[PDB]
RNA sequence: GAUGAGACGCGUUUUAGAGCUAGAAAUAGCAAGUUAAAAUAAGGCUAGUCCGUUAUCAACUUGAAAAAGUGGCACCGAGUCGGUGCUU
DNA sequence: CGTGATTCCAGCGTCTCATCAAATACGCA
DNA sequence: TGCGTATTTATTGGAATCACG
């Protein structure tokens, strides 16, 4: 019971735990079993694993929330449009909007005429005959000057507002500029007139078809550059073309500018950057930029609308009418040609909705792509369809007006069409003339991203602040929403608070206070020595002020030489001085001060300390906002101190990034006794010159005490809140929370005794043959070799490591100039550049293909320096072709030096011991805080529980070297097994090397890993001395013998004990047997975490009308039998009810008991009042006490070990684990991994001999699977088919049969049934669609660890 | 990458879009086919251009809810955990 | 007439704007 | 040379359908 340890394995879908003792034994304890059964106690081994679904992200929820908000706002836009038209529409037709709102209802449910637009059959038919589409009506309203019906005008405006296009372009977009040729020629002429010394020729360049083609952006750019003579990708006119296409070039090096100001047109106003540029370059660029703007508009418009704008003022309605006319003509031609040539297929094409024909393209679910793919061979087979096929090649055959590619239409086109309609119709309807502005605002209004939801303090996503409390509308939005405050909260609601003080916002990165603090902190520790003086001394306040004034303020960058010369000789009159504490140049620089001096040109204003806070606000404004107008609005407060030109210059400048410390730290806190802030202490601290870290960690000052006292707010908050603040995927956070709860429960298990040690290992989350072939080809081409031409090779064939190295090594040995043969791969060997006794490097950087074994020349160290000198030129040739990396080249060439130094072994042990990931560090912090809570009275932490972080590499090497193989397809026990091994390794490490604690164990322990660890070239005595081991390997003490290089083996003592304390750490004669017995234990606490299902109500797909009760109504008044609806609801949790239901026409009461599925939609109604919900469902006289809530994955034990996990009200899942013997697992791993098994060739031969001599294990495993299936699975057909398939392929090789058996293990796996394959036979899944059996089984409530159980006998809870 | 916020195109259903000719009707033949309104998780109250799909979740005793509490040891073994003895 | 046994199937693309953080690869005092 | 910094980042119910004897 005393001195136990806990090992854990954290994963995205599993958390394995194992409690071990000092002797590496897993205890077994009697746990009391609660409930109403005859069982009172059970025996449980303290090892197991918790299984749960992956933690989903909120991305889908966020997208659905945005979709809901957008739908609500679109409906509100339609409501506003109806509000504008309410009185006039009521004058014309009072029920028009009512018919529009009830158009969805069937004729029976309609309270008005079934025709929405006109209310009568004749007028509706006339409208649809005159206007086949809405675009015909839109074009008619745009062009015709006759008075139009109000209903048609409203319909056009509603279509425009409801579908208004994107807002990716700022400013107006005139649709007339559609002729690409004329505008391109004009831009070419302007460019030639600008740079007359560097003209270009545009003759024979039809840019319209080049840029308007349905091709890639970069492809079209390259084609246009190639077409233009003397034009390149980076050419200035090419830069203008890229700007039109969507790039952001500049004109710095183009013989004009001295800085790198950039201008872009697709974003922002663009009317201020252009003016600023023209202020420098005059009016020369005005015509060129006008032509560039025209071409940029034309490039978009030509692809958006091909129709010329001279004919009509609505180029989008005209384009859609052209689409309709082409569709009609092509449809008639296709009908005629098909009826003429292929009449038989005509019946299918135009009537079979199930096929991807025209009927399936229009009335069916087939899309444009599917329709084209189906009808292209038919068109090619026929004759006279050449034009139709040409149209199909351009994806312009039988097109619809509402297609998937209408997302490139900007809102400017719809706005222009709406404006044209309002201009035409304002003369007849005065209210249209009055509300034209309101309608345009409705169409063009878009909530700024920095404003967010327009809530009123009842939402957890909103941050908007209101100047006044009133209903927000587009017409008064700027009059209500505080845009500046909204953007300030938008930026600051997600920025990090100060590390020391959590209640204060952090300062901007480029704030003057931050830069001054950094400069003073850096100058605090600077020391200077002169020849005359004896001892180095710090800089005084006056000296630092003079240095800042003369160096940091005069020049942006300050160097050590500049400090020595420009100040000490000019002011201090010191000819020579040696300065320590700064190298090359200072890291801190007053760049913001220089920028402000350049902008405002006011030395006094910047130097004045009174104006400093105003600057702290100005820089905060510049960092906070990026919109020019709101930046000007925020700077209006300080606009009374600077001129309009200075204000504009400040507006144009931008800053990004945030600092790490707040003003409350730098100057917000003052020492009680001295009355000085951190900055004040940095300015003058006597001669000690304490830096920021010393100031915040000084007992003589109240800084640390005040920081801690203000840090108690939020200190030790809820565990869930702390885990949520961590950085990582939500699944990993769920795993961390489950691990912490498992640790707490395990501590509860052991009598409230904290474990001596805790070990953790978080598995890292998250074709290549073609990449390897590409790399080899690039290297060969760069080096100029032609070995690839001599010997053909394939991408996949390079997957073999030996052949991959062979092609990388120029078909030669890496150490010997002799050639190599592909046929003799077995005759060749793979050797590690750094020996296995020095590093566990299994990558290509370490593996090398060598024919011989003694050709290295040096066994202990890196191969002999003579071979290195011989192969240096060839290795350099390989490096120049990028066939190898630089680090492996250095490792190979280290034979030039004396050998592998202690730095290499220190790096190796650092690599092998600790993980660089910070998520494991945060998990260790959480565990240490929750376990080590006692505080020593000496201001120290009582580290009574050690938290160790181990890499998966160590456990994997342990398994692959000591034959503790794992197979993930057998069962989930491997999870727990890994945890156990982790614990063992961790304990076996910390007992073996107590002086490396700070390497792995979480804590502020002393650090020494260079001299005290690595010994001299003394294998026999180096380990015996204070040095741990000459070899850098961490787990070499586990093995009995260690192979040094190739061919020679050294021997270690059979019992490994600590050198200093003398404690026995590893008994190789007993510990291995204990580990084998632990891994062979059949009883492992595998727990599937029961979860109430959350998410969507049902399938989002809306099914058509159907006379079935499985459909879910989309709305309260919409009967699914007439309007369709959703189906396939998701059950959050089942409910076991014991009640009676009326049966027969006599309504006799009969006792019943069954599981009722409570869906996500009905969860709230059931939880509000279960009795009424059950009565509505049909049950009568429900017993509330016997109502049992069963979440998903609820465990039931029926009989003879059969365990079923509840998955729904009408389906179960397999809930048993197959405790396959470890011998079978090892045999399967060896046989399946017949190749690439790694290790010495003798070991590989021994493993192959074992596999060949234990072929009967295949039949034994088949019999085991059959027995387990008959005992638990009870899948007769699947088991019979598996047996037949196994008997059919008994003559297949051992590796294939082993892999097929691994696949066959899917039948008996835990969880939902799944289909698998045995060679070519495909076995499906037997689904247990009956939940009537679990009503008489034994329900099991399992705790998180599963040791604490409660068995409820459901047979007792029966009405009979 | 995670979290947020603004938008866009669709997609899907019901109805409108008269299908016509002949044929007792069934049914044949021919015609048309592009579009539109409504909804897009049921809905809730706080009534907002708000919120409704993330996370949390053995059971029992509590505690509104958070949260808390609720369960001999050792030994031999082992087909999913059993027995042996002590305490209990 | 349940009773298995079989089959099909499941909303989805495109932009903008932040913020943070760890991950990875140098910088540096 | 560790702290510090500059950019980059198919599954499993459900429903229907199909023998089906």
XYZ file of C-alpha atoms (C1' of nucleotides) in Angstrom, chain A residues 168 267 449 490-491 494-496 581 583 585 587 626 658 660 727 916-918 922 1099-1101 1325, chain C residues 4-24 27-29:
48
model
C -14.997 42.164 -51.394
C -8.969 46.823 -50.574
C -16.354 42.826 -38.425
C -12.834 43.814 -30.555
C -9.040 44.087 -30.462
C -8.599 38.691 -27.239
C -5.204 40.197 -26.339
C -3.257 38.664 -23.468
C 27.020 43.452 -21.232
C 27.603 42.547 -28.052
C 24.701 46.228 -31.062
C 18.770 44.772 -28.899
C -6.552 49.672 -39.202
C 1.455 43.776 -28.650
C 4.483 41.599 -22.887
C -3.106 25.832 -25.960
C 10.255 19.979 -26.340
C 6.441 20.116 -26.420
C 4.858 22.575 -24.018
C 1.404 22.216 -18.895
C -29.982 14.873 -40.291
C -29.941 18.307 -41.915
C -31.081 16.889 -45.267
C -21.042 -5.966 -39.935
C -33.887 -11.199 -39.665
C -30.956 -9.879 -43.743
C -29.631 -6.250 -47.214
C -28.911 -1.715 -48.920
C -28.277 3.390 -49.017
C -27.062 7.112 -46.944
C -25.807 11.062 -44.350
C -25.325 19.698 -46.348
C -21.322 22.356 -48.969
C -18.088 25.391 -51.388
C -16.027 30.750 -51.553
C -14.113 34.966 -49.545
C -12.797 39.266 -45.593
C -11.203 40.827 -40.511
C -8.779 40.256 -36.133
C -6.816 37.949 -31.630
C -4.017 34.739 -29.343
C -1.093 30.807 -28.736
C 2.773 26.528 -29.711
C 6.073 24.843 -33.591
C 10.126 25.499 -35.867
C 19.555 35.568 -32.432
C 21.764 36.843 -28.771
C 23.879 38.550 -24.535
